[PDB]
Amino acid sequence: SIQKSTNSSSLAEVIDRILDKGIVIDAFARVSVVGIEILTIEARVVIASVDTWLRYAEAVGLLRD
Amino acid sequence: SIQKSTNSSSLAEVIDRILDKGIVIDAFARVSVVGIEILTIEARVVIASVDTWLRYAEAVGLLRD
Amino acid sequence: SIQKSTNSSSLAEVIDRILDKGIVIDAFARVSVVGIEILTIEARVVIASVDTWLRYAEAVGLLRD
Amino acid sequence: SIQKSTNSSSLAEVIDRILDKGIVIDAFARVSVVGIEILTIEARVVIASVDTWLRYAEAVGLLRD
Amino acid sequence: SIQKSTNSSSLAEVIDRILDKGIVIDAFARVSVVGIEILTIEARVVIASVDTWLRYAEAVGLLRD
């Protein structure tokens, strides 16, 4: 191709650049009464391409040893 | 590309620059009566890219030893 | 880029400069009758980027020893 | 940048300059009858950036020894 | 900057100059009948920046010895 005065790029390349960084959303909350932990919530979400989800899974320990 | 008189940058690069710094929102409250801790709340939220959520997780201790 | 006669900066850089200083909001109150501490409240909130929330957490003692 | 005839500065820098000095609001009251301290109130509030809230916390004694 | 014929200064600098002097408001009253101190009130309020509230607290004795 040829060089241009503008940097702007394609939608499919925005998607690819998002997925090979990935996203983690992570949260917890706890509610206690008189010292007893009467309610608790924990949640996590991960989104990525395969080659980066393997990075996550190999560090956390979901692949075979 | 070529140099310009203005610095302004793309939306996908704002998103990437936010996620590789990450965000932590952290809070607790306690209500006590006669010296007994009759109610308590604690919460935390984390948002990041995978490579920076691993920074958090390795310092706090969520990865295998 | 090139130098200009004005200093003004981008919204994403205001956000980044806030989060790498962080914010702490901290309060307590106590109500006592005849010498007995019949009611008490304590609360704290913290907001930061990951690299500065780790500063807080390492000084207060939330990371593994 | 270049020098100017006026000193005026940005809103984000006012906020930063407030938070790295911090604010303490501190009060108590006591009501006594026949020599017995039948009612009492105490309250405190602190606001700062992380690096200055640590100054407060290290002098008052909220960090690990 | 450059020198001018007038001394006037910014609102954020008025606030800073107030808080690093601080304010103390202090009062008590006592009502006695036949020689018995049947009612009494005492109150205090303090406002400052952190570095000057520590001056108060170190002289009165609220910091660890």
Numbering used by the authors:
A (entry chain N), B (entry chain N), C (entry chain N), D (entry chain N), E (entry chain N): 2 to 66
What does the primary publication say about this deposited structure?
Gas vesicles are gas-filled nanocompartments that allow a diverse group of bacteria and archaea to control their buoyancy. GVs have therefore evolved as rigid, thin-walled structures composed of a single protein unit that typically polymerizes into large cylindrical shells closed off by conical tips. The ∼7 kDa primary GV protein GvpA forms the core of the GV shell and the cone-shaped tips. Here, we report the 3.2 Å cryo-EM structure of the gas vesicle shell made from the structural protein GvpA that self-assembles into hollow helical cylinders closed off by cone-shaped tips.
We expressed and purified Bacillus megaterium GVs that form narrow tubes most suitable for cryo-EM analysis. We used a combination of two- and three-dimensional (2D and 3D) classification techniques to select 4% of the small GV subset corresponding to 35.6 nm diameter and used helical reconstruction to obtain a cryo-EM density of 3.2 Å resolution. The cylindrical shell is constructed from thousands of GvpA2 monomers polymerized side by side into ribs spiraling into a left-handed helix with a helical pitch of 48.8 Å and −3.87° helical twist, resulting in 92.93 GvpA2 units per helical turn. Contrary to postulated models, GvpA monomers and not antiparallel dimers form the repeating units of the helical assembly. The carboxyl-terminal residues Asp67-Ile88 are flexible and not resolved in our structure. The central β-hairpin, tilted at −36° relative to the long axis of the cylinder, forms the core of the GV ribs. Helix α2 folds back onto the hairpin, and helix α1 forms a bridge across the ∼16 Å gap separating adjacent ribs. The inner wall of the GV shell forms a continuous hydrophobic surface consisting of a dense pattern of hydrophobic residues located on the luminal side of the β-hairpin and helix α1. We located pores in the GV shell formed by slit-like openings between α1 helices of adjacent GpvA2 monomers. GvpA2 monomers are held together tightly by lateral connections along the GV ribs formed by an extensive hydrogen-bonding network between the β strand backbones.
